[PDB]
Amino acid sequence: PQITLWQRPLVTIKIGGQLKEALLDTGADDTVLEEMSLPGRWKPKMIGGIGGFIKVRQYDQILIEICGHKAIGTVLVGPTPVNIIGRNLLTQIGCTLNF
Amino acid sequence: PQITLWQRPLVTIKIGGQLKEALLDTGADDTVLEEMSLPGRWKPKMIGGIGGFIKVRQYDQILIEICGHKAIGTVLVGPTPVNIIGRNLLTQIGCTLNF
Numbered sequence: 672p673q674i675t676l677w678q679r680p681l682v683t684i685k686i687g688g689q690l691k692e693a694l695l696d697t698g699a700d701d702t703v704l705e706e707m708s709l710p711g712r713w714k715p716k717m718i719g720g721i722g723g724f725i726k727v728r729q730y731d732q733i734l735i736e737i738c739g740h741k742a743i744g745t746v747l748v749g750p751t752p753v754n755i756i757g758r759n760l761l762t763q764i765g766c767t768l769n770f
Numbered sequence: 771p772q773i774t775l776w777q778r779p780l781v782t783i784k785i786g787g788q789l790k791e792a793l794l795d796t797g798a799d800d801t802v803l804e805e806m807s808l809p810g811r812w813k814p815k816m817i818g819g820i821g822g823f824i825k826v827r828q829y830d831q832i833l834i835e836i837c838g839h840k841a842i843g844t845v846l847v848g849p850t851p852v853n854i855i856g857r858n859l860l861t862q863i864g865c866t867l868n869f
């Protein structure tokens with residue numbers, strides 16, 4: 672698809688067999704989702720920006736489906752105000768900026 | 771152009787006659803620049819980010835060039851981690867996400 676930026680670029684994702692809404696975010700290095708369980712090992716991380724920093728759990732090699740596109744990559748889980756799909760997974764679905 | 775996301779989408783902008791580096795950020799509603807001098811009056815603006823909300827300065831109808839593309843619109847100024855070009859100006863230069 673071609674997604675406009677007149678509104679926030681929100682899409683449906685499937686992860687851990689759950690359907691969620693998330694923001695396609697070219698300014699985010701990493702994908703960050705609100706508190707949820709994920710399988711496997713994890714390590715803590717801090718991410719930050721306007722407003723300060725939050726602590727997240729980093730899970731690697733997680734399967735995700737983004738607007739019907741299957742991918743795998745690292746997912747950070749923690750108290751983000753919005754679910755974010757970052758560049759680590761946008762690349763895998765072939766997402767580009769165009770003007 | 772078409773910008774892939776394997777690296778941060780950092781571009782050159784021009785504002786107040788000066789070149790600066792800024793991030794094309796589809797996760798930011800607004801354009802937010804590092805502390806600088808801009809003309810005219812400003813108004814207060816609360817913006818939300820990963821750690822919470824903060825107050826920044828809002829300047830309207832400011833000339834800014836993004837990758838050579840001329841724009842005129844609202845620029846926020848505050849303690850942003852990096853200069854950010856958000857959806858208000860991305861929309862104005864005709865940028866979309868595509869996959």
Ligand SMILES: O=S(=O)(c1ccccc1)N(Cc1ccc(I)cc1)[C@H]1CNC[C@@H]1N(Cc1ccc(I)cc1)S(=O)(=O)c1ccccc1
Nearest residue numbers: 698699700701718719720721755797798802818819820851
């Ligand atoms: O500072 S920011 O929260 C911001 C928001 C609005 C306007 C200006 C700034 N930021 C930009 C940012 C850019 C580079 C770096 I280094 C750190 C932050 C965001 C906006 N989109 C990407 C960043 N994030 C996503 C986000 C989007 C919307 C909201 I509401 C909250 C978080 S992030 O969770 O912080 C982030 C930080 C590190 C790794 C992955 C994700």
Ligand SMILES: [Cl-]
Nearest residue numbers: 743744745759
């Ligand atoms: Cl990854």
Ligand SMILES: [Cl-]
Nearest residue numbers: 762765774775
């Ligand atoms: Cl590619």
Ligand SMILES: [Cl-]
Nearest residue numbers: 843844858859
């Ligand atoms: Cl504007």
